[model samples]
Target chain A: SNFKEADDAIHYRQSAFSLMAHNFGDMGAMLKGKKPFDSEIFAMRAQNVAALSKLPLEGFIPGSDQGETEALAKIWTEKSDFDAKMKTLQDNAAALLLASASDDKKLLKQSFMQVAKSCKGCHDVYKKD
Target chain B: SNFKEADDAIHYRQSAFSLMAHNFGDMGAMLKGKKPFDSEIFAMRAQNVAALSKLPLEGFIPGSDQGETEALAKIWTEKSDFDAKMKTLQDNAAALLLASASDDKKLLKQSFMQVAKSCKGCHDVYKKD
Candidate 1:
């Protein structure tokens, strides 16, 4: 569970979030009809985000506060709530995978928004602008 | 299969690599005995690397070479070779996960180095610095 260094933890966690957002955004474009719906690509992105949802949070170790980060210090202060906020993102990501598998476009957007909402729930409370 | 922009693709790929390296290094520390041997963490890291190995390479799309990247132009010049170079990393990463699950320590390091060597094999030819 220990990262090699605080900076490594910072960058590693940031990278996790960056990857998640990249994949999520790809899925988003299709859900919003900004791009043509390609089920294979959408489902693949959903799979990536689901796998990635399990990462990142572990990087918020002690002494990581001084490192480069957009995470607010309150993440540590309210670790319980902060950790709980991640649940919906994980749950929604998993659901999004299944929704994409079903070929139910309506369900896909709903699932995607659940993840977005979950991410925003934490960011609103714990991240720095 | 299309990323939004060249730089987005570049950063997305870099983040995928960064996450894989981070998880891989965590496993490396325990295998080296620099940290206490923790089977759970080791296997978890292995699981992560296996999932991440399937990503990243997709982000090396056409026009991404000019983006902020350490990838050399030769990746496009020798696209087939560059793509094939990733095979062993994916293979070894998957093997590492299996080895870790079996609790056979000796095979774990061998598996880890196989992935590392595969990484260096491509980097030596295709990456800048």
Candidate 2:
């Protein structure tokens, strides 16, 4: 009954988010000055996050909504809004990548804030705590 | 005395490896034909894995070997060998990144296998499991 497919999708999406969280956490520590800022490290982490931003969308396929996932049903019911939030994350991640490559700390901080906010915005409506 | 630092290092290293495993799993599935081979997706995952490969080395501080980690003591006792294995993983990862960019499945497969083998080489001596 496609149960395995749904399970696989749930696991895949979870893994994608887990990786995003790991890279973002590293970048966040640098932004907060908990870790020394290395422009190369920042750029690499930002690029990884940006690349991974393209993955989770496909994992949200139909039937995954009813599985062992933190995804809220509104993701399906309010599809356009969910899609917009995801796009915001992707855009902000890409912007952060550019900001990191520019080696401008001010721009990188601003871009990082925008990306973090976008993640929270999606989690607020679409994901369960 | 610096238990907190050791614990943090252990956590960070584990997180880095976990992310690498996640991305590598995706690419491995594509290589095995368990998942569709999308060149762009393979390329992105390879790049992310490569970026993450640079992270764990810094987490292997002296005190971390005594902590709640799967890392074997040989990581410190056989430091040169451990570092060499890490370099092997890095080199193979870079090659895989280029192969993925070339969009040649044969090359990609060969490079992916090399990276995978490099990972196993490290884990065989350095990790508990």
Candidate 3:
């Protein structure tokens, strides 16, 4: 049971990151004017940010099985750090939601940086190689 | 023909970051002594690094067609920034290889930071929330 769950969780986690990469690419297009920063696009990207915020928490909870993905096993064990990073990303995305509504380029840029920092912060401590 | 190649290239580019996040988790376990730092593990991670080094260049050519990802469309349209970031990542990964061979923890950490910076550099310019 544990093995199966772990495997499933791992796959989900990997997919989450994959999905994030996809959405981030979309967001980039919007920012650069290659793609219009229209309502539909903003809504889609906001949804993407929401999805990305969910990935780590779902797989990293204590006793939840995680598969072969790079998310550290400590994600389950080192609960505090795990939660903190997830919180940071979630909060950043929440901020982005407000910025998205404003459609202010400067604010959007700042919001994006906040999100990037959250990712970088986690990557710094958690990711290896 | 160009569109097809561009699509394939974007797929590869997206896969590259996915692989990176995947391997990063694996490396984390090894660093924490949760996963044995065996020859097999080292070799596998190294190979992953090699693969990650190839993605951006493949899909970000001026006329390449990237799929619906948040990677800024400018990645394909703007040559200089894209190339610079990719080069940074490649150089960092190359340095990481040397550090890995040395089996020096400090060096490896430093090398990893360099790689992370490359990711950050690109994310700064290209990613969105």
- Predicted structure with the largest lDDT when compared to the true one: 1
Q: How far out, in Å, is residue B87 in model 2?
A: 2.5
Candidate 3 C-alpha lDDT tens digits along B21-71:
666556656666776666456645655564456444555555544456666
RMSD per candidate (Å) reads: 1.8, 3.9, 17.2
Write candidate 1's Cα lDDT for B17-103 as tens digits.
988887888888898988898999898999999999999898889877784799998899899998888877888888888898887
- How do the residues A32-113 of candidate 2 rate in per-residue lDDT, one tens digit apiece? 9987877887888898788778767867877677857899877898988998888889999999998887877788889999
What is the C-alpha lDDT profile of model 1 across A43-126, one tens digit per residue? 899999999999988889977888578888878888888878787678888898888888877778788989899888888888
Off by over 4 Å in 1: none
* Clash number by candidate, in order: 0, 0, 11
Native contacts recovered, each model: 0.85, 0.10, 0.00
Give me the displacement of residue A108 in model 3, in angstroms.
0.6
Error of model 1, residue B66, in angstroms: 3.0
Error of 3 at B86 (Å): 38
Q: Which parts of model 2 have CA positions greater than 4 angstroms off?
A: A1-12, A15-19, A25-40, A58-61, A64-69, A103-105, B1-12, B33-38, B66-68, B103-105
Per-model TM-score of chain B: 0.95, 0.93, 0.77
> Lowest-scoring 10 consecutive residues by lDDT in candidate 3 chain B?
B1-10
For residues B1-129, could you state the per-residue lDDT of candidate 2 as single tens digits? 212478767876776686678788889998899878888888888987887787678678896788588999878989998988898889899999888889677888899999989988788777897
Between candidates 2 and 3, the one scoring higher on lDDT is 2
Docking class of 3: incorrect
Local error of candidate 3 at residue A63 (angstroms): 7.2
Sorted on DockQ, best first, the list reads 1, 2, 3
> Candidate 2, A96: how far from true, in Å?
1.6
